[PDB]
Amino acid sequence: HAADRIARLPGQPAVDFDMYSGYITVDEGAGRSLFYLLQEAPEDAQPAPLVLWLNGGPGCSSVAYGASEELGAFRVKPAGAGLVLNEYRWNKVANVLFLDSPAGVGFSYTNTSSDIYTSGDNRTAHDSYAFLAKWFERFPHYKYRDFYIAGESYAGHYVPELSQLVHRSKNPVINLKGFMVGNGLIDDYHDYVGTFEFWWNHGIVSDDTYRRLKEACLHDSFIHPSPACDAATDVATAEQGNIDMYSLYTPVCN
Amino acid sequence: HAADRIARLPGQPAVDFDMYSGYITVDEGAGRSLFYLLQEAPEDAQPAPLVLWLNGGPGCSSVAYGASEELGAFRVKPAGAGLVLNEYRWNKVANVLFLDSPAGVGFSYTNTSSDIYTSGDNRTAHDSYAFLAKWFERFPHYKYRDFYIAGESYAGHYVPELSQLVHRSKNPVINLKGFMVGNGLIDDYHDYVGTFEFWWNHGIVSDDTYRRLKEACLHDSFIHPSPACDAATDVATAEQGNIDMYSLYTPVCN
Amino acid sequence: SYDPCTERYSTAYYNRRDVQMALHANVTGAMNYTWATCSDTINTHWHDAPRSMLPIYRELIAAGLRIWVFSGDTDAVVPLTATRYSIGALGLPTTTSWYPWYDDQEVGGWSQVYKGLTLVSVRGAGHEVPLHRPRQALVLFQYFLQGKPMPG
Amino acid sequence: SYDPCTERYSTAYYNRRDVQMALHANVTGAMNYTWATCSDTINTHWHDAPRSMLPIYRELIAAGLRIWVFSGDTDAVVPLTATRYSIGALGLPTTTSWYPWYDDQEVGGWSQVYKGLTLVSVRGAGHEVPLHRPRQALVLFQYFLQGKPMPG
Numbered sequence: 001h002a003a004d005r006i007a008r009l010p011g012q013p014a015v016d017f018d019m020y021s022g023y024i025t026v027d028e029g030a031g032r033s034l035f036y037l038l039q040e041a042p043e044d045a046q047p048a049p050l051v052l053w054l055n056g057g058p059g060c061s062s063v064a065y066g067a068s069e070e071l072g073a074f075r076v077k078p079a080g081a082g083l084v085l086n087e088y089r090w091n092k093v094a095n096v097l098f099l100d101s102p103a104g105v106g107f108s109y110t111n112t113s114s115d116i117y118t119s120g121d122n123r124t125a126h127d128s129y130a131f132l133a134k135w136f137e138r139f140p141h142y143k144y145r146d147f148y149i150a151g152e153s154y155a156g157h158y159v160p161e162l163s164q165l166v167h168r169s170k171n172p173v174i175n176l177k178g179f180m181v182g183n184g185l186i187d188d189y190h191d192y193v194g195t196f197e198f199w200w201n202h203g204i205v206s207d208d209t210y211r212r213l214k215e216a217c218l219h220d221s222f223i224h225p226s227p228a229c230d231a232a233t234d235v236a237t238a239e240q241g242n243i244d245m246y247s248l249y250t251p252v253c254n
Numbered sequence: 255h256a257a258d259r260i261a262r263l264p265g266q267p268a269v270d271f272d273m274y275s276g277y278i279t280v281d282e283g284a285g286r287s288l289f290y291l292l293q294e295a296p297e298d299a300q301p302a303p304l305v306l307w308l309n310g311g312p313g314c315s316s317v318a319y320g321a322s323e324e325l326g327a328f329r330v331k332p333a334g335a336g337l338v339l340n341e342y343r344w345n346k347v348a349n350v351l352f353l354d355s356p357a358g359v360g361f362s363y364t365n366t367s368s369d370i371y372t373s374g375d376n377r378t379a380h381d382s383y384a385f386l387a388k389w390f391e392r393f394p395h396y397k398y399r400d401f402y403i404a405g406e407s408y409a410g411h412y413v414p415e416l417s418q419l420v421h422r423s424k425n426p427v428i429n430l431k432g433f434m435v436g437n438g439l440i441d442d443y444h445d446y447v448g449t450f451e452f453w454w455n456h457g458i459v460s461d462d463t464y465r466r467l468k469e470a471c472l473h474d475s476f477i478h479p480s481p482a483c484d485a486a487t488d489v490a491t492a493e494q495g496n497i498d499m500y501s502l503y504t505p506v507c508n
Numbered sequence: 509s510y511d512p513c514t515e516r517y518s519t520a521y522y523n524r525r526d527v528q529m530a531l532h533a534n535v536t537g538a539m540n541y542t543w544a545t546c547s548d549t550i551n552t553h554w555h556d557a558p559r560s561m562l563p564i565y566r567e568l569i570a571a572g573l574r575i576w577v578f579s580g581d582t583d584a585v586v587p588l589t590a591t592r593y594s595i596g597a598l599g600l601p602t603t604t605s606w607y608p609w610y611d612d613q614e615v616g617g618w619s620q621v622y623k624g625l626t627l628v629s630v631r632g633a634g635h636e637v638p639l640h641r642p643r644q645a646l647v648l649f650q651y652f653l654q655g656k657p658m659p660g
Numbered sequence: 661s662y663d664p665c666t667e668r669y670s671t672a673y674y675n676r677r678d679v680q681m682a683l684h685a686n687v688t689g690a691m692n693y694t695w696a697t698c699s700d701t702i703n704t705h706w707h708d709a710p711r712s713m714l715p716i717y718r719e720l721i722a723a724g725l726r727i728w729v730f731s732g733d734t735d736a737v738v739p740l741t742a743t744r745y746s747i748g749a750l751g752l753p754t755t756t757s758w759y760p761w762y763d764d765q766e767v768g769g770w771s772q773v774y775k776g777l778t779l780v781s782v783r784g785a786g787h788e789v790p791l792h793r794p795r796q797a798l799v800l801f802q803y804f805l806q807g808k809p810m811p812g
């Protein structure tokens with residue numbers, strides 16, 4: 001644990017809280033090891049709760065997003081020259097743990113190359129659980145700490161699937177109090193119906209495309225649309241133009 | 255006409271186009287006189303088209319809005335200390351005429367005090383027509399100029415009602431080429447249905463309020479809602495909070 | 509940079525005699541009331557107003573007039589969806605389906621050209637388009653004066 | 661001030677050995693590929709995924725867990741309306757109807773408290789809430805840690 005401690009990052013400004021990063025092996029058979037980043041709260045704030053933050057994709061890095069351009073302690077400089085401190089970082093009130101998941105994402109890796117062509121919700125969750133159970137062994141002063149799980153987007157799946165596991169596990173050192181999801185997947189049918197309605201309601205697609213989308217995708221999964229849905233979706237993409245679909249009214253990077 | 259010419263406005267920066275403002279009597283009986291503001295285009299751009307711009311309300315001033323915080327040549331300074339030039343002013347390409355209408359709005363006045371309790375679409379349009387027909391007599395070098403009528407909001411009514419009149423009048427000096435409407439009333443039923451849908455789609459009202467609004471207002475006029483519609487609308491106003499309903503994501507003035 | 513307090517300034521300004529003098533307004537000083545941005549009375553004492561403008565558009569389209577309809581997409585008073593349904597009810601045919609128009613390299617809004625009428629939305633603009641998106645609002649205006657479709 | 665180019669910077673940064681050294685990452689240097697923000701392969705080779713999370717929410721609500729759901733209202737990828745319909749389909753009862761929450765004197769977003777779950781939207785924020793509305797995003801977080809409803 002002390003071994004996982006970070007002294008300083010390049011370009012990092014001086015701070016008053018500790019930080020830790022390293023790997024946990026969740027599958028010795030396969031050689032699957034997840035990388036974490038813990039940004040603690042300041043001493044005075046202790047002992048604060050422990051928050052596991054997960055990014056979506058599927059396939060996107062919690063360190064890459066959560067820690068670096070969202071709620072983490074620092075922001076990266078242009079050209080990747082150094083770090084700047086985040087005035088609104090969440091680790092002001094809690095101990096934030098960022099997990100790169102699944103194996104093959106970010107700094108997280110697998111020793112079984114096949115591993116990356118066969119990921120799914122089930123194994124992602126089981127590895128995530130394993131990671132937590134050993135993480136508490138590496139960091140025993142964290143046992144019994146109120147714990148919360150949070151995430152965005154495809155983590156609408158991750159967060160509740162993992163919470164479910166944690167809960168049914170009945171592990172006595174994990175004091176799960178709850179979870180929070182931002183902009184995430186909940187129910188395929190309803191999300192599709194709502195996505196299209198909001199698009200038409202924001203002037204981003206035509207009346208026809210809107211109708212084609214509803215008729216092409218309602219029986220589909222978000223993750224595995226049919227060819228009719230893809231066709232529909234390709235027209236819409238062309239009606240949307242060169243916009244940041246993740247933030248309708250802000251500029252696109254050049 | 256030369257008499258209506260403006261030398262300079264207080265605080266006004268130096269410009270390279272002329273400007274004219276004054277009154278036209280549209281009803282000698284009633285003593286109804288409309289005030290106009292003409293911001294011409296630069297010499298080099300001449301001879302440019304003539305554009306009548308109308309603000310809505312009903313009851314709001316085209317000079318107050320159109321000319322002063324929208325498309326007009328200048329912007330007013332805090333405390334109303336002076337003017338600043340508008341870099342994107344429309345009078346770069348056209349001769350813009352701003353009409354205060356109806357009688358009782360802005361600088362526009364009536365000699366019959368009753369006049370202001372009985373305004374309606376019909377008389378607004380007839381006075382507007384009268385104004386144009388005499389305005390061309392005051393400014394004869396404008397006859398035959400391509401003419402366009404434009405406006406916002408409640409001018410969704412004004413613009414097309416006036417265009418209709420101009421067209422059926424067959425006045426040979428008015429070369430009406432068309433009209434343009436921004437964010438305006440078109441059809442009461444459809445606008446109500448669309449307004450509520452967009453609101454729910456922008457997170458500004460609850461699921462219940464949305465349903466109550468549809469059920470309370472669909473048979474109504476925008477301008478004269480029923481008491482059921484007003485009740486519904488009062489709840490919505492309370493769900494919206496302290497926002498600028500005219501621009502969802504910009505700040506409110508303090 | 510946007511200042512949501514403009515009406516205030518305007519109120520102060522047009523109320524100076526200086527200015528009214530300069531505008532040839534309330535010459536005899538006979539306007540027995542302060543200058544206001546809108547008239548409340550008028551506003552709250554409106555009478556006749558048809559429920560639909562659709563019939564008139566039809567007459568003027570048949571007449572061959574140039575007709576453009578626009579919308580600032582972040583207004584909530586007379587929102588974009590209200591305009592989509594009302595225009596949709598004219599039943600005109602589409603000449604060029606909903607497409608993104610550019611100003612520079614940014615999307616300025618979307619447009620749809622129907623036989624007889626052009627629909628234009630302005631991205632990120634509130635009710636008062638030229639206030640919120642001045643630059644894109646001038647483009648809009650120039651294309652209409654020409655009768656050319658929104659670019660890009 | 662917002663810079664829409666952050667992923668770029670991050671790509672450059674995490675790719676330095678300096679940094680990886682500092683993080684105790686790719687220690688043996690054995691990661692036979694450049695560092696990326698997401699993994700394409702992974703992304704395009706996903707297998708199992710249920711269609712609904714509703715059943716799980718039900719189980720965890722019944723379990724008594726604290727559950728908050730939030731939404732940046734200008735995201736178009738997983739938009740607010742998608743979340744309104746999905747949460748609406750849990751059928752829970754409402755404890756406090758949709759109301760505006762403030763941060764200072766500005767409306768931060770809207771909220772609805774149901775029996776077992778709290779729904780929060782963030783005004784003007786895109787998909788990555790803490791990036792777009794950092795300040796309001798910290799408020800959000802603090803209230804949830806406390807189990808207190810959004811204020812104002």
Ligand SMILES: *[C@@H]1O[C@H](CO)[C@@H](O[C@@H]2O[C@H](CO)[C@@H](O[C@@H]3O[C@H](CO)[C@@H](O)[C@H](O)[C@@H]3O)[C@H](O)[C@H]2NC(C)=O)[C@H](O[C@H]2O[C@@H](C)[C@@H](O)[C@@H](O)[C@@H]2O)[C@H]1NC(C)=O
Nearest residue numbers: 024025026027028029030031032033110111687688689690
């Ligand atoms: C994923 O694959 C890595 C490439 O094998 C592998 O790294 C290797 O770790 C070996 C085993 O634990 C290690 O081996 C023996 O070590 C000693 C050296 O002191 C020798 O006397 C033995 O004959 C072998 O050399 C080998 O040195 C090492 N190679 C490299 C490049 O590091 C990983 O397995 C192990 O990774 C480490 C760092 C840790 O997880 C270890 O305890 C792992 O089993 C493997 N990563 C996994 C499985 O998570």
Ligand SMILES: *[C@@H]1O[C@H](CO)[C@@H](O[C@@H]2O[C@H](CO)[C@@H](O[C@@H]3O[C@H](CO)[C@@H](O)[C@H](O)[C@@H]3O)[C@H](O)[C@H]2NC(C)=O)[C@H](O[C@H]2O[C@@H](C)[C@@H](O)[C@@H](O)[C@@H]2O)[C@H]1NC(C)=O
Nearest residue numbers: 278279280281282283284285286287364365535536537538
């Ligand atoms: C709205 O009401 C105004 C108050 O009456 C009125 O203004 C008055 O205009 C009168 C008439 O045209 C004018 O009168 C006569 O003028 C001469 C002075 O040289 C005398 O010899 C006569 O015995 C009367 O005095 C009177 O001076 C004037 N009063 C004021 C305060 O200006 C408006 O009527 C007229 O307004 C003008 C400026 C213009 O429109 C005139 O030609 C109008 O009939 C009236 N405004 C209207 C009806 O539009």
Ligand SMILES: *[C@@H]1O[C@H](CO)[C@@H](O[C@@H]2O[C@H](CO)[C@@H](O[C@@H]3O[C@H](CO)[C@@H](O)[C@H](O)[C@H]3O)[C@H](O)[C@H]2NC(C)=O)[C@H](O[C@@H]2O[C@@H](C)[C@@H](O)[C@@H](O)[C@@H]2O)[C@H]1NC(C)=O
Nearest residue numbers: 027028029030120121122123124125126127129130708709
């Ligand atoms: C979801 O994922 C869990 C855990 O990954 C699955 O359960 C695991 O099932 C596998 C076989 O899939 C077991 O692994 C082998 O078991 C033996 C050890 O006793 C050895 O052959 C070997 O070394 C392991 O690879 C594993 O024990 C088991 N883990 C747990 C926590 O139970 C689960 O798959 C099913 O669940 C199994 C327990 C069993 O029913 C399998 O045969 C199943 O496929 C996954 N759920 C889904 C989508 O099937």
Ligand SMILES: *[C@@H]1O[C@H](CO)[C@@H](O[C@@H]2O[C@H](CO)[C@@H](O[C@@H]3O[C@H](CO)[C@@H](O)[C@H](O)[C@H]3O)[C@H](O)[C@H]2NC(C)=O)[C@H](O[C@@H]2O[C@@H](C)[C@@H](O)[C@@H](O)[C@@H]2O)[C@H]1NC(C)=O
Nearest residue numbers: 281282283284374375376377378379380381383384556557
């Ligand atoms: C819409 O508004 C037009 C014009 O304002 C109306 O037509 C006008 O009708 C009035 C009576 O309302 C006429 O005014 C009087 O007529 C006499 C002059 O010959 C004199 O008594 C007097 O000095 C005037 O006040 C006016 O001539 C007429 N103007 C026009 C352009 O025709 C119209 O109302 C109806 O249209 C009239 C012509 C006639 O049918 C009236 O009796 C009507 O009320 C308005 N439309 C609506 C909503 O009724």
Ligand SMILES: *[C@@H]1O[C@H](CO)[C@@H](O[C@@H]2O[C@H](CO)[C@@H](O)[C@H](O)[C@@H]2NC(C)=O)[C@H](O)[C@H]1NC(C)=O
Nearest residue numbers: 360361522523534536537538539540541542543
């Ligand atoms: C027309 O000019 C009038 C004369 O100045 C002016 O009336 C004013 O009313 C004031 C209140 O805003 C009062 O304090 C001041 O004395 C002033 N003058 C007189 C003698 O009444 C009107 O506001 C003006 N009409 C407008 C602006 O429509």
Ligand SMILES: *[C@@H]1O[C@H](CO)[C@@H](O[C@@H]2O[C@H](CO)[C@@H](O)[C@H](O)[C@@H]2NC(C)=O)[C@H](O)[C@H]1NC(C)=O
Nearest residue numbers: 106107674675686688689690691692693694695
């Ligand atoms: C793990 O460290 C590796 C060693 O530096 C690194 O591999 C690199 O691959 C480069 C291309 O981006 C190559 O140009 C460079 O020589 C470098 N080193 C070697 C010897 O291969 C990996 O990118 C790194 N893995 C990550 C970042 O996941």
